[PDB]
Amino acid sequence: MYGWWGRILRVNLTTGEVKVQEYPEEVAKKFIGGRGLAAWILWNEARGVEPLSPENKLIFAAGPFNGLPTPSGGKLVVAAKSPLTGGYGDGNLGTMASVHLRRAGYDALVVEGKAKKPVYIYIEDDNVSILSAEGLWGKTTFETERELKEIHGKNVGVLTIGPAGENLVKYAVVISQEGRAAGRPGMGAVMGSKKLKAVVIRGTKEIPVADKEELKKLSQEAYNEILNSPGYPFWKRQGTMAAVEWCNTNYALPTRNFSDGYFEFARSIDGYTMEGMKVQQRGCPYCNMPCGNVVLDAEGQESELDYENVALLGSNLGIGKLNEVSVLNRIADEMGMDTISLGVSIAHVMEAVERGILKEGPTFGDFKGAKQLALDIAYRKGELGNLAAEGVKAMAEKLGTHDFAMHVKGLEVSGYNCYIYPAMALAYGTSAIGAHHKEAWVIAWEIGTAPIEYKISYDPIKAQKVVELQRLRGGLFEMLTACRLPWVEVGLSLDYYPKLLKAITGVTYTWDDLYKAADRVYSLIRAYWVREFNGKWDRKMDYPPKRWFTEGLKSGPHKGEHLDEKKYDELLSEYYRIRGWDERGIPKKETLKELDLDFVIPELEKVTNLE
Amino acid sequence: MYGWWGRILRVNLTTGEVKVQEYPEEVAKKFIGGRGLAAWILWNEARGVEPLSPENKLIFAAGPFNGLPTPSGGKLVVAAKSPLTGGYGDGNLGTMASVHLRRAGYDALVVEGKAKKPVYIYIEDDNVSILSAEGLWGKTTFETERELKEIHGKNVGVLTIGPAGENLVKYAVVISQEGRAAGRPGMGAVMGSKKLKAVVIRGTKEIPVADKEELKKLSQEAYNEILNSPGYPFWKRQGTMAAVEWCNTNYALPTRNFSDGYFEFARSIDGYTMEGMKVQQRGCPYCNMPCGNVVLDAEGQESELDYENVALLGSNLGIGKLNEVSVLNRIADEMGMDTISLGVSIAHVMEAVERGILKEGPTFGDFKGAKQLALDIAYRKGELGNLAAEGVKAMAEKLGTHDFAMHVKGLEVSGYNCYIYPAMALAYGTSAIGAHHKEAWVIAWEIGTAPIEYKISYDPIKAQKVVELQRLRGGLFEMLTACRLPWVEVGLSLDYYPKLLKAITGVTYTWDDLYKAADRVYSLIRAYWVREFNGKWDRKMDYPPKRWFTEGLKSGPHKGEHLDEKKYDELLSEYYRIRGWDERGIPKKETLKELDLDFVIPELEKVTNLE
Ligand SMILES: O=C(O)CCCC(=O)O
Ligand SMILES: O=C(O)CCCC(=O)O
Ligand code: SF4
Ligand code: SF4
Ligand SMILES: [Ca+2]
Ligand SMILES: [Ca+2]
């Protein structure tokens, strides 16, 4: 067996039992890795479990690309049943832990149970142990990783959670190297519910490879294709930050709880303001086009900036100064919570406060009051902070404000306002983990321009586009698992991936093999959702926030414009038609059979009727 | 089996293998523990090994008294074939690591082999792992323990080495809780040769006790006896620091490399001075008469003072200010090196400079120069720091300065000058592990007074009092293992020890049983020494330094007075007669049998002729 090890590391924090599970090579070929392997595990071992209970499974999954020198192939998926959405959840993050876990001899690490006291998992090749992390509990993500490296060395990958993960904030995440995050859907809350403060990994093994020479040829070429791409220079300069100006110009910039797609102070928080505030640039393992742009915030501290971070904590909050948005950004990072869901919950609170619904709380443009709430959420302090720490869906039900609750399936909407973008909106509505642009960032295509550098329409081909993209971004790249930006941003030929896959594993994968493998994962995940919800499911699940229907842009040539229900409903049906799902968004027995997901039928039939 | 677990933890740094060896109940009954158990182990497992080679065994041996609430019973022994002496070496220190080791289900821990990189041993009950310490190597013992506690919490026992151990300074020791130390013969240099930086222990298990009620009552009774003894108030004030004045009053205070027994500036480095420089008081686990007195040094740094540290690093160096001696004290502690051997090796250099044998180096009184040499020794900087790091015996061989080399068997002499004290001289000459006062601090009885508050004679009864003292100090107390000071200083009845042992292990030990056990340990160790010295051995190995025979006190009414070789030789013969040894200091066959050491005879018989 090449590329894959065929081994999964298992740790039971309740019994302290540690073992290695071997899985069949055909499971490897079938799901490839990352989100593929993660969905397989959660389907079998996370049936009906309470998201914050010890029975839920915290999965750290890499793919055949990880552990090896591959173009930006230092990513890693973190999956578990989501405490926020209640369905399947996962996220991705770059980290040397990805490299170590795999050189250590594992394709994945599954964690179950819950320790009696704060602990952290230590892995050094075959030497794996559960140690006390009692002295760490309470410390930021930055400090925890720092102290751990001060004991074990620099040659390690470290995953940690901040006070927000410990306090179980629904959108808490897992951090690494003061900047990389993963698990918007509560993966950090799960890691916290298990009394797991961190994971430290070091691996020195040689990962078996089918064609060593071709792996080197391909990698060198792909690396050089990046270096020589026309978009490399501007990418190096602004990274994902270039989307601020791009979204504003196109009215896709979330402003004041997505009330508008235009922000008057966008200049004071864009890639050009960022550029003049930069003091350092970091990146993920094996990446030659780093985009972890570090600036200094209004308090002299370092903040690693990303577009979604700034849009959600900046324009979305009505804050027009980047060094102040940078302060909030850093907090989210050390407290260990999702910048996106955190910004949407705060933005939600500001609107509600302004509407007279909430009596105490910050308003838009209120940096200080926003900074106090971000911290109050991190430590669940007081009534207001504890509520917002539950997310907008939960918060909405309590405050009775479904009106301006920007989420889909329970996950807060990303940094793209879609009042006039059917495809991107469909993208958000159909995301396998909930509202996210992860799997399908189609607004760029739908518009015709890209940050690296209009008449609405619900054309059926858009649903086809959203599906093709999801195969690549929500499928291939999440199973490899490598970075999509090289391809997305600087245009690296995708033809490199099936070839690298064949060089590493020895197995030929055609593009159809991949779309199928990708579609298999999408349906299995959709099935997991349905089963967990006990059959209570239908198309509305796949609907975008209702605000994009009842109101429209508040300024610009498209003022007043929004999305149309009837036409969106058809776009979706078309989507379901392509995927092979009924008008409830549930996969059909024929489709599941097609994708080798037969074993899923008996389980779903017990909760609803299949077609 | 009660009291003892009959279990020994084995860690092989080389192969990483970790197991638990079960040892008989007669072996426990026979050797009781601590030093007893360590000698049995070293005899069998460290046969012909290089003290600094991977084959050497690093032992952390506890005893029936450890892990349980026994009066000042938080001690622990550290043993291994000595790098400085080449014979059996060991030390003792008070540390929570003594309690936690036993509460984890082990009587002792035996490290063997050598890690391929800086590592530390982690123990939490049955969970034992060899972790990376690459980020710790190079840091002071103080910093190492603080950092590990910041990770695993305060509720643990940590044992560490400083750069002196790391660099293999021959008199390198193991440190704990900033101040507590063990292993003068270079236990720290053995820990370092294994690339072992520390040991973190935590125990929660409940130890099997034959009579739980008796143990309680006996202990409650022992503590009160301590609390009410007349010497308690003063002991709380000066600890062992009261020995400076008393030693100066008796011409026993080592001054300028043992050149004299009186120091004109003894007052500014005495217990009353210390008393007015005290900012904190610490102690070992389970002791109600703490004696770790903390002063602020010349540099404002906390320093834990003990008589021996101040005597060999102060008056012995000719340094008369206590805040300056404390500085050298702290350095010893944080670098991980025995204050005694460090001070004697330095004084030796100082005397060597003054006499012009050495062209460079500090002189008596030169604090700045002594501090620099001390730091140069720990880091082995320069020809001088390097030579001095070898100890006076080796240094002397190099400089040809055998005349003022204050050691016996390679181990440097303690803080008691014996120009006119035949018993104490015999104590140093026969100390099992080489020159030390641990096993026989007879000088107080020989004078008729003690610090807690003269005619030279060689009465053969002096050889008896030494053996008697050794049975208790170098035996019982190193086997239990508990602190001897509550008995020595405040006078707690020695009758609690046989009853407590009985209440713990269930066995009834009579004082003759104990005297026999201690004697077994003594003949075994001598056996070890002779065997490892390849039969090359004679009575001179038990002789005190030449200086005390060919020179005398330089001041006071005893001016000019010294020791008579002939009359000492006679005292040694009485010692050998009592112990049942030949005129060569080697145990006699009938003696070995008598002590159940028959298995020693065939082995020694291979290197010399027995009697
Ligand atoms: O700006 C973003 O958040 C998305 C970057 C492009 C991509 O999602 O691949
Ligand atoms: O002052 C010392 O160093 C010795 C204290 C008494 C003893 O050794 O038991
Ligand atoms: S492009 Fe950015 S996110 Fe992707 S691997 Fe490189 S540094 Fe990481
Ligand atoms: S008397 Fe001193 S050395 Fe003995 S146990 Fe107490 S604090 Fe420790
Ligand atoms: Ca980031
Ligand atoms: Ca001390």
Check if the beta carbon of residue B469 is closer than 8 Å to that of residue B463.
Answer: no
Three-state DSSP class for A486?
helix
* Annotation: CATH topology of A239-416: 1.10.569
| Ligand 4 center to B439 CA (angstroms) | 16
Cβ count near B104 (within 10 Å) = 24
Ramachandran angles phi, psi of B532, nearest 5°: -65, -25
* Closest residue on chain B to A145 (Cα): B151
CA–CA distance, A434 with A440 (Å, rounded to integer): 12
Q: Which residues contact B323 (CB under 8 A, 6 or more apart)?
A: B277, B295, B296, B297, B298
Q: Are strands B174-176 and B180-182 parallel, antiparallel or unpaired?
A: antiparallel
CA–CA distance, B201 with B60 (Å, rounded to integer): 12
Which residue of A150, A153, A155 is in closest CB contact with B147? A150
CATH code of domain A210-238+417-600: 1.10.599.10
CA–CA–CA angle B262, B266, B270 (5° rounding):
130
CA–CA distance, B414 with B247 (Å, rounded to integer): 12
Q: Does the beta carbon of A91 lie inside 6 Å of ligand 3?
A: no
Per-residue tokens: A207: 């990962």
Per-residue tokens: A102: 């795999």
* Helices of type H across B336-431: 339-354, 367-378, 382-388, 392-399, 422-430
CA–CA distance, A79 with A62 (Å, rounded to integer): 11
Q: After which residues is chain B broken (C to N over 2.5 A)?
A: 453
Check if the beta carbon of residue A521 is closer than 8 Å to that of residue A433.
Answer: no
Per-residue tokens: B156: 């643990």
Cβ count near B406 (within 10 Å) = 29
Closest Cα in chain B, distance from residue A380 (Å): 24
Per-residue tokens: B293: 């007195």
* Closest residue on chain B to A155 (Cα): B134
Q: Which residues pair with A260 in a beta bridge?
A: A255
- E strands present in B57-179: 58-61, 75-81, 88-94, 108-112, 119-124, 127-132, 157-160, 174-176
Number of A:B CB contacts under 8 A?
A: 67
Q: Which residues contact B298 (CB under 8 A, 6 or more apart)?
A: B321, B323, B324, B326, B327
Three-state DSSP class for B119?
strand
CA–CA distance, B524 with A102 (Å, rounded to integer): 52
What order do you get walking across the sheet with B292-296 strand by strand? Answer: B278-282, B292-296, B302-305
Q: Which residues contact B240 (CB under 8 A, 6 or more apart)?
A: B291, B306, B307, B308, B451, B485
Amino acid identity at B601: I
Experimental method: X-ray
Q: Which residues contact A278 (CB under 8 A, 6 or more apart)?
A: A293, A294, A295
Three-state DSSP class for A513?
helix
CA–CA distance, B125 with B607 (Å, rounded to integer): 43
Return the DSSP state at A527.
H
Chosen for mutation from A116, A132, A160, A199 (greatest number of chain B CBs closer than 10 Å) is: A132
CA–CA distance, A76 with A73 (Å, rounded to integer): 9
| Ligand 2 center to B328 CA (angstroms) | 20
Q: Which residues contact A441 (CB under 8 A, 6 or more apart)?
A: A416, A424, A427, A469, A473, A488
Residue with tokens 């049998």: B593
Per-residue tokens: B589: 């066959």
Amino acid identity at A373: L
CA–CA distance, A12 with A57 (Å, rounded to integer): 10
Check if the beta carbon of residue A190 is closer than 8 Å to that of residue A85.
Answer: no
Ramachandran angles phi, psi of A200, nearest 5°: -125, 125
What would the 3-class secondary structure string for A527-539 be? HHHHHHCCCCCCH
Per-residue tokens: A110: 């599954």
Given its phi and psi angles, is residue B22 left (phi above 0), alpha (psi -120 to 50 degrees) or beta? beta
Three-state DSSP class for B294?
strand
Q: Is A611 exposed, middle or buried (0-12, 13-18, 19+ CB in 10 A)?
A: middle
Best of A223, A238, A483, A484 for a ligand 3 pocket test (most atoms within 8 Å of beta carbon): A483
Q: Are strands A108-112 and A7-12 parallel, antiparallel or unpaired?
A: parallel
Chain A interface includes B17 (CB < 8 A): no
CA dihedral (B156, B162, B168, B171) positive or negative: negative
Return the DSSP state at A76.
E
Q: Which residues pair with A19 in a beta bridge?
A: A10
Contacting residues of B for A129, CB less than 8 Å apart: 122, 127, 129, 131
List the resolution, Å: 2.4
Q: Does the beta carbon of A285 lie inside 6 Å of ligand 3?
A: no
Check if the beta carbon of residue A329 is closer than 8 Å to that of residue A307.
Answer: no
Three-state DSSP class for B154?
coil
Three-state DSSP class for B347?
helix
What would the 3-class secondary structure string for B433-489 be? CCCCCCCCCCHHHHHCCCCCCCCCCCCCHHHHHHHHHHHHHHHHHHHCCCCCHHHHC
CA–CA distance, A25 with A39 (Å, rounded to integer): 16
CA–CA distance, B129 with B121 (Å, rounded to integer): 6
CA–CA distance, B2 with B505 (Å, rounded to integer): 5
Q: Which residues pair with A199 in a beta bridge?
A: A121, A159
CA–CA distance, A93 with A482 (Å, rounded to integer): 10
Q: Are strands B108-112 and B119-124 parallel, antiparallel or unpaired?
A: unpaired
CA–CA distance, A525 with B194 (Å, rounded to integer): 51
Q: Do A151 and B135 touch (CB under 8 A)?
A: yes
- Domain locations in chain B as residue ranges: 1-209, 210-238+417-600, 239-416
Q: Which residues pair with B19 in a beta bridge?
A: B10
Ramachandran angles phi, psi of B200, nearest 5°: -110, 125
Best of B176, B291, B484 for a ligand 4 pocket test (most atoms within 8 Å of beta carbon): B291
Q: Is A609 exposed, middle or buried (0-12, 13-18, 19+ CB in 10 A)?
A: exposed
- Ligand nearest the Cα atom of residue B444: 2
Per-residue tokens: A512: 């159809």
CA–CA distance, B254 with B246 (Å, rounded to integer): 12
Amino acid identity at A420: I
Q: Which residues pair with A132 in a beta bridge?
A: A119
Q: Is A329 exposed, middle or buried (0-12, 13-18, 19+ CB in 10 A)?
A: buried
Q: Which of A:386-415 have CB within 8 Å of B? A: none
Contacting residues of B for A136, CB less than 8 Å apart: 150-151
CA B91 to chain centre: 4
Contacting residues of B for A132, CB less than 8 Å apart: 124, 151-153, 156, 202
Amino acid identity at A590: E
CA–CA–CA angle A494, A338, A75 (5° rounding):
30
Check if the beta carbon of residue A159 is closer than 8 Å to that of residue A198.
Answer: yes
Which residue of B134, B152, B153 is in closest CB contact with A153? B134
CA–CA distance, A196 with A305 (Å, rounded to integer): 27
CA–CA distance, B118 with B131 (Å, rounded to integer): 9
CA–CA distance, B132 with B111 (Å, rounded to integer): 16
Superfamily of domain B1-209: Aldehyde ferredoxin oxidoreductase, N-terminal domain (3.60.9.10)
- E strands present in B248-392: 278-282, 292-296, 302-305
CA–CA distance, A282 with A333 (Å, rounded to integer): 15
Check if the beta carbon of residue A315 is closer than 8 Å to that of residue A254.
Answer: yes
Q: Are strands A292-296 and A302-305 parallel, antiparallel or unpaired?
A: antiparallel
Q: Which residue, by CA, sits nearest to atom 5 of ligand 4?
A: B72
Check if the beta carbon of residue A425 is closer than 8 Å to that of residue A568.
Answer: yes
CA–CA distance, B342 with A272 (Å, rounded to integer): 62
